[PDB]
């Protein structure tokens, strides 16, 4: 799993 | 699964 | 499945 | 597990 | 385990 | 175990 | 065990 | 055991 | 045992 | 109820 | 009820 | 209830 | 209750 | 209760 | 109760 | 009770 | 009770 | 009771 | 009075 | 009075 | 009065 | 009066 | 009166 | 009156 | 009156 | 009156 | 009156 | 003079 | 003079 | 003169 | 003159 | 003149 | 003249 | 003139 | 003139 | 003139 | 030369 | 030359 | 030359 | 030359 | 030459 | 030459 | 030459 | 030459 | 030459 | 190949 | 290859 | 390779 | 290799 | 190799 | 090798 | 080798 | 070898 | 060898 948030 | 949101 | 929305 | 936050 | 905080 | 604090 | 404090 | 204090 | 105090 | 707006 | 507007 | 706003 | 704001 | 602020 | 501030 | 301040 | 100050 | 001061 | 424009 | 603009 | 701007 | 700014 | 700034 | 600054 | 400074 | 300085 | 200095 | 464009 | 742009 | 930009 | 920037 | 910077 | 810096 | 430094 | 240093 | 040193 | 696009 | 993009 | 970006 | 970045 | 960084 | 660092 | 360090 | 150290 | 030490 | 979409 | 997205 | 993201 | 992050 | 972090 | 930390 | 610590 | 401590 | 202590 990969999550990216900005 | 891939999701992209902006 | 592919969905694109703008 | 890797988490990065700034 | 490694944790870094600043 | 290693801990560093400043 | 090693501890350093200043 | 070694202790140093100043 | 060694102790030093000043 | 569901509402979506953009 | 369903409404769609664009 | 769920609300999302950006 | 959960609230998230950025 | 949990609150986080930065 | 736990509080952390920096 | 525990308090830490620096 | 324990207090430490420097 | 124990007190230490320097 | 109601006005709607898009 | 209510006004909404996006 | 309420105003919201983003 | 309440004002919030970020 | 309450003011908060960061 | 209370003021806090860091 | 109470003042604290570090 | 109480004053403390270090 | 009490004064302490070191 | 008034001009409006969208 | 007034100008508005988004 | 007033200017606002975001 | 007033200027505000963030 | 007043200037504030952070 | 007043200047404050931290 | 007053100057304070720490 | 007053000067204080520690 | 007064001078104090330790 | 002038070009405008939206 | 002038270019503007948003 | 002038360039502005946000 | 002038450059500004934040 | 002048450089400022924070 | 002048340099300032904190 | 002048140097200051703390 | 002048040097000061504490 | 002058030297002072304590 | 060139593609443009808005 | 060049890609641009906003 | 060059990548730019904001 | 050069990487810049803020 | 050069690394800079703040 | 050079390392600097504060 | 040179090391400096305060 | 040189060592200095205070 | 030289040693100095106070
Ligand atoms: Cl990515
Ligand atoms: Cl993509
Ligand atoms: Cl597509
Ligand atoms: Cl990373
Ligand atoms: Cl690291
Ligand atoms: Cl380390
Ligand atoms: Cl060490
Ligand atoms: Cl030692
Ligand atoms: Cl010894
Ligand atoms: Cl939907
Ligand atoms: Cl969602
Ligand atoms: Cl979330
Ligand atoms: Cl969290
Ligand atoms: Cl924690
Ligand atoms: Cl702790
Ligand atoms: Cl302790
Ligand atoms: Cl002890
Ligand atoms: Cl309608
Ligand atoms: Cl509405
Ligand atoms: Cl709202
Ligand atoms: Cl709010
Ligand atoms: Cl608050
Ligand atoms: Cl508080
Ligand atoms: Cl306190
Ligand atoms: Cl006290
Ligand atoms: Cl006492
Ligand atoms: Cl109109
Ligand atoms: Cl308007
Ligand atoms: Cl406005
Ligand atoms: Cl304002
Ligand atoms: Cl202010
Ligand atoms: Cl102030
Ligand atoms: Cl003061
Ligand atoms: Cl004083
Ligand atoms: Cl005195
Ligand atoms: Cl035009
Ligand atoms: Cl323009
Ligand atoms: Cl401009
Ligand atoms: Cl500027
Ligand atoms: Cl400046
Ligand atoms: Cl300066
Ligand atoms: Cl100085
Ligand atoms: Cl001096
Ligand atoms: Cl002297
Ligand atoms: Cl084109
Ligand atoms: Cl382009
Ligand atoms: Cl670029
Ligand atoms: Cl760069
Ligand atoms: Cl650099
Ligand atoms: Cl350096
Ligand atoms: Cl040095
Ligand atoms: Cl030396
Ligand atoms: Cl000597």
Numbering used by the authors:
A (entry chain A), B (entry chain A), C (entry chain A), D (entry chain A), E (entry chain A), F (entry chain A), ...: 1 to 6
Authors' account:
High expression of PSMαs, which are four peptides of about 20-residues in length, increases virulence potential of methicillin-resistant S. aureus (MRSA). Amyloid aggregation plays roles in PSM activities in S. aureus. In the present study, we investigated the structure-function relationships of PSMαs and their short truncations.
We found that the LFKFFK segment from PSMα3, identified as fibril-forming by computational methods and which indeed forms fibrils, shows dose-dependent antibacterial activity against Gram-positive Micrococcus luteus and Staphylococcus hominis, but is nontoxic to S. aureus, the secreting bacterium. We obtained two atomic resolution structures of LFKFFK; both revealed a departure from cross-β fibrils and atypical amyloid architectures. One polymorph was fundamentally different from steric-zippers, displaying no dry interface between pairs of β-sheets. Instead, hexamers of β-sheets formed cylindrical channels running along the fibril-like structure, effectively yielding nanotubes. The hexameric configuration lacks the tight interdigitation of β-sheets characteristic of canonical cross-β fibrils, such as PSMα4-IIKVIK and eukaryotic steric-zipper amyloid segments, resulting in a smaller solvent-accessible surface area buried and lower shape complementarity at the interface between the β-sheets. Moreover, the cylindrical architecture of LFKFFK polymorph I is reminiscent of that displayed by a polymorph of amyloid-β fibrils, and a HET-s prion fragment. The FF motif is present in the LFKFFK segment, and the hexameric structure of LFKFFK resembles the FF nanotubes. This farther support the role of self-assembly in antibacterial activity and specifically the hexamric arrangement that forms channels along the fibril axis.
